[PDB]
Amino acid sequence: SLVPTLFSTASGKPVTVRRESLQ
Amino acid sequence: EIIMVTTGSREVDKLLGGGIETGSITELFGEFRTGKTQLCHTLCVTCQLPISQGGAEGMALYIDTEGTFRPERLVAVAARYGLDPEDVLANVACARAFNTDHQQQLLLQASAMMAENRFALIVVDSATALYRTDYSGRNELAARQMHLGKFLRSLHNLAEEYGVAVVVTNQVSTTRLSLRKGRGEQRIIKVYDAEAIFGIYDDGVGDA
Ligand SMILES: Nc1ncnc2c1ncn2[C@@H]1O[C@H](COP(=O)(O)OP(=O)(O)O)[C@@H](O)[C@H]1O
Ligand SMILES: [Mg+2]
């Protein structure tokens, strides 16, 4: 289960992170 | 564990003993049009360069609070260093946050991204545009400097933990550098303590 972020690649690709990582 | 990311100018790197150090926070102080953002853009590509070329061989995390991040500049810099622009654009993550609500969550997200993937530089342009409003967003934020101080403290922790270089820009362990305007379109940088002249070009920061 990944979680959305406010970050995005300069190429425009949205960035996601695993919830456990945010945990 | 500490590497020096080339700034694109040999003279500046010589004054900075190789360039921007990793694992620590480097604060850029300068008025408008001093090249603070342009320097950050150049570093976002140099951090991806091979160590031999003065890079940290890592990605870049750009926190834009001034809304002045332009991916096209990164492309021009990549051309100078002979790096595929597509890769450099994919190796730079950026979050444009003007509200305090989003700005307050960036640090947490940055840590997770740095834990999942290898980053070499975290850019914050600028701390001046950070925490301008309160959490609601309706009013002015009380004691902004106290809130900003805690932000930098956590950012220094990320710097030490993930061994990433952190460049924070300010309009007008921490290494403080001052930017100024030279004779012409040249720029002068010096530590708060001995000065070096660098130029801003399409390819980005450089010498002469
Ligand atoms: N493509 C370019 N070629 C040459 N000089 C540039 C270019 N882009 C920006 N500059 C120079 O960068 C200087 C500083 O811009 P910037 O870093 O955005 O300012 P600040 O330090 O206030 O954030 C400007 O005065 C301008 O002359
Ligand atoms: Mg700026």
Numbering used by the authors:
A (entry chain D): 107 to 129
B (entry chain A): 134 to 305, 333 to 353, 360 to 374
Paper text:
Interaction of BRCA2 through ca. 30 amino acid residue motifs, BRC repeats, with RAD51 is a conserved feature of the double-strand DNA break repair by homologous recombination in eukaryotes. Oligomeric RAD51 binds to the resected strand, forming a pre-synaptic nucleofilament (NF), which then invades homologous dsDNA that serves as the template for repairing the lesion.
In the crystal structure, the overall fold of the LiBRC1 peptide is similar to what has been reported for HsBRC4, with Phe113 and Ala116 hot-spot residues binding the two hydrophobic FxxA site pockets on the ATPase domain in an identical manner to BRC4. The β-turn, mediated by 115-TASGK-119, is also preserved and closely resembles the human BRC4 in its hydrogen-bonding pattern, with a Thr115 side-chain stabilising the turn through hydrogen bonding to Ser117 and to mainchain amide of Lys119. The β-hairpin is stabilised by a Thr111 residue, positioned -2 residues prior the FxxA motif, forming a hydrogen bonding network with the backbone amides of Val121 and Phe113 on the two antiparallel strands of the repeat. The extended β-hairpin fold promotes the LiBRC1 peptide to form a small hydrophobic core mediated by the side-chains Val109, Thr111, Val123 and Leu128, as well as LiRAD51 surface residues Leu241, Gln242, Ala245, Met246. Leu112, which precedes Phe113, forms additional hydrophobic contacts with a hydrophobic cleft formed by LiRAD51 His235, Leu239 and Gln242. The C-terminal α-helix starts with a cationic Arg124 residue that forms electrostatic contacts with LiRAD51 Glu249. In sum, the crystal structure of the LiBRC1:LiRAD51 complex reveals a BRC repeat binding-mode defined by an extended β-hairpin at the N-terminus forming a small hydrophobic core, an Arg124-mediated salt-bridge, and a lack of any interaction with LiRAD51 at the C-terminal LFDE motif.
